[PDB]
Write a protein that binds this ligand. Structure first.
Ligand SMILES: *[C@@H]1O[C@H](CO)[C@@H](O)[C@H](O)[C@H]1NC(C)=O
Ligand SMILES: *[C@@H]1O[C@H](CO)[C@@H](O)[C@H](O)[C@H]1NC(C)=O
Ligand SMILES: *[C@@H]1O[C@H](CO)[C@@H](O)[C@H](O)[C@H]1NC(C)=O
Lengths: 128, 128, 128
């Protein structure tokens, strides 16, 4: 298989989860299912989140069920996120984003130019 | 073509633009033209900027004409930048850095150990 | 040789140095020797450090003897580090971490879920 990557639009929040869309001008080699990026091949990956968020937000990055989610810091202006993680992912991992906030804040949250990039740095076993 | 990369020295500011030099101990596979890194091959790239800047600075990273430049945050000391972006670049994109400041501040700006690294993570079409 | 990578546990501090262990669920292609990651192949590498540190800490990242170490910033909570560097490494470079603090603070320092990831992005000469 090819180097695994996905660049998704992070479009909105509903019921405490950020929606992720594959609608970007990018050649995608991973699937999005139920607003999660589906890992098929093992490897070290970069996970990168960018966006202009119009509420001060507490977003959690979930990447593997056996580790705690990473709380994503905002930049000092309290309006932008530009955050990079490197992580060891495996087949069946789901990369997704949740919001720890009252649901009213979630449903109203505006995200400008939000994107999530997941990109494989090292090769590994791929599921059939 | 080889994996596309450039590690450039970010040397000074003139007329609101940071100068970028290919004078580093690095095997360069991209060109610098008029203080911009010239993209020849499509791909996801990391763009990384580091430096010790002796004025508190508002630097904008320009990477593609159809998206807004990214305002680069300083570290909390107000003296250093160590910043990582992942972006989707294409043939004809120019990666460059501008300074939003009075020109006197620009002309006097000292940058210690400034460097810009642009490195391809995924393969793509390369221009002839 | 394969793409060079190591994901190590950053376990504790002793005598001003953070200990690095290869005991992680990762296929390692670099060695740890005396709590340093031993570089065998030239390349641009990402160096990534994450951890929850229960003292506000001043950690220095050493990666090559001809450049100054990078002082690692904490996130704004004063409790976590999630930090990414891109650097040009060569055969004989040693990547290691030191703590600038009274030794009592070092010996007592608790690090939860500490890890250092060093991963090659571009190929280069490898030592025999
Ligand atoms: C989508 O995700 C949420 C997880 O909270 C769940 O409620 C819902 O049933 C999922 N739908 C499926 C299984 O596709
Ligand atoms: C270099 O860049 C600046 C862009 O502002 C421009 O003024 C100048 O004409 C350029 N020179 C060329 C075309 O190489
Ligand atoms: C381990 O590292 C420290 C460096 O400060 C040194 O004191 C010690 O002798 C080293 N041991 C060796 C050579 O493996």
């Amino acid at each position: 298989p090819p180097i695994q990557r996905l660049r998704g639009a992070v479009t909105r929040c509903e019921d405490g989860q950020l929606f992720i869309s594959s609608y970007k001008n990018e050649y995608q080699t991973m699937e999005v299912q139920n607003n999660s990026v589906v890992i098929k091949c093992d490897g070290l990956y970069i996970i990168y989140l960018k966006g202009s968020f119009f509420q001060e937000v507490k977003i959690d990055l979930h990447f593997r069920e056996d580790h705690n989610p990473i709380s994503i810091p905002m930049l000092n202006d309290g309006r932008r996120i530009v955050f990079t993680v490197v992580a060891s992912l495996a087949f069946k991992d789901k990369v997704y984003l949740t919001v720890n906030a009252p649901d009213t804040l979630c449903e109203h949250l505006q995200i400008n130019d939000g994107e999530l990039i997941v990109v494989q740095l090292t090769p590994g076993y791929c599921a059939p």
